[PDB]
Amino acid sequence: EIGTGFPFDPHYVEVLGERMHYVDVGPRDGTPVLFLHGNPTSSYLWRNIIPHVAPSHRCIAPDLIGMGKSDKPDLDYFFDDHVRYLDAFIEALGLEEVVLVIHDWGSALGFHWAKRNPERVKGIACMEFIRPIPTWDEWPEFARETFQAFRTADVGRELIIDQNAFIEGALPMGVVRPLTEVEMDHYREPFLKPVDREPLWRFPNELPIAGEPANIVALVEAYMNWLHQSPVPKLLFWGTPGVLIPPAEAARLAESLPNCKTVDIGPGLFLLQEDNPDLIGSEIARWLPGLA
Numbered sequence: 207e208i209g210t211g212f213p214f215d216p217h218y219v220e221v222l223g224e225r226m227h228y229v230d231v232g233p234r235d236g237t238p239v240l241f242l243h244g245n246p247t248s249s250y251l252w253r254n255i256i257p258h259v260a261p262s263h264r265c266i267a268p269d270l271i272g273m274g275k276s277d278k279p280d281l282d283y284f285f286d287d288h289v290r291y292l293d294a295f296i297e298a299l300g301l302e303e304v305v306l307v308i309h310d311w312g313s314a315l316g317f318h319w320a321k322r323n324p325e326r327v328k329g330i331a332c333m334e335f336i337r338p339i340p341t342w343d344e345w346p347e348f349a350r351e352t353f354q355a356f357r358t359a360d361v362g363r364e365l366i367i368d369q370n371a372f373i374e375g376a377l378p379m380g381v382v383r384p385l386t387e388v389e390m391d392h393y394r395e396p397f398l399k400p401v402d403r404e405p406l407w408r409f410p411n412e413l414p415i416a417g418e419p420a421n422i423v424a425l426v427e428a429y430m431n432w433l434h435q436s437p438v439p440k441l442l443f444w445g446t447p448g449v450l451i452p453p454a455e456a457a458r459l460a461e462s463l464p465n466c467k468t469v470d471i472g473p474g475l476f477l478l479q480e481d482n483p484d485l486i487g488s489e490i491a492r493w494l495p496g497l498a
């Protein structure tokens with residue numbers, strides 16, 4: 207009863223010499239809602255959320271470079287590669303003011319973009335977003351050994367690239383209900399060839415955990431500082447027990463982030479969109495009219 211289909215016409219735009227695929231539905235003009243997915247997903251992640259928003263608002267949901275149906279350039283796929291390509295995607299569409307609905311590395315992208323263009327963002331809805339993790343102590347045990355293994359050049363690449371462990375292992379573990387084979391196949395699709403799994407490996411290696419990578423730590427601290435100061439309307443979805451944003455961190459953020467409404471989505475881990483897309487979509491639709 208959670209839709210497995212992806213009923214959106216493909217759109218492609220030429221960005222820095224590569225084609226990037228994106229969803230584009232709703233009204234053809236006006237403030238768009240920009241959906242940014244993270245690892246190891248694609249615009250597919252928003253398939254059940256978009257239909258709640260698209261009646262009233264243009265919806266745009268790109269596949270990040272090297273992911274989903276986007277082209278696969280021979281890049282190192284650092285977070286900085288993702289920044290360059292998303293910045294260029296936004297301009298290629300000539301987007302002006304936007305609302306962001308962001309998740310995971312998409313949240314790192316969203317917040318980083320919002321910090322650099324504060325006058326162009328009308329609101330931010332986020333869930334399970336990237337914040338600095340001071341120590342492995344704070345990383346949930348059930349996945350601690352796994353992610354520490356991910357974050358090596360030898361064992362980590364063997365797991366993620368050669369064994370597709372991020373897709374076959376971490377993905378379904380990040381969802382409370384069991385993903386169906388049909389859903390898994392949509393998610394496996396961009397990564398059928400081991401060669402195409404570079405971004406899947408570099409991404410966990412970019413997580414700001416115990417002060418490394420230093421450049422990502424400083425960058426994520428900068429947008430966290432910007433968030434605690436910014437009057438931008440915020441909608442924060444959180445699950446129980448959650449992974450990146452546990453119930454107690456949500457509660458704190460509700461107080462320390464200005465203009466921040468929170469929504470309890472019930473049981474949830476990493477991919478909150480795969481556990482309760484109905485409430486996330488409906489709560490976004492309810493939130494939008496209050497923006498403008």
Ligand SMILES: CCOc1c(C)cc(C)cc1CNc1nnn[nH]1
Pocket residue numbers: 244245246310311346349353372376377379380381409410411413449475476
């Ligand atoms: C407990 C670990 O949580 C995760 C779980 C449980 C599943 C997935 C797919 C991802 C993560 C982590 N998020 C992530 N790793 N690299 N880029 N984003």
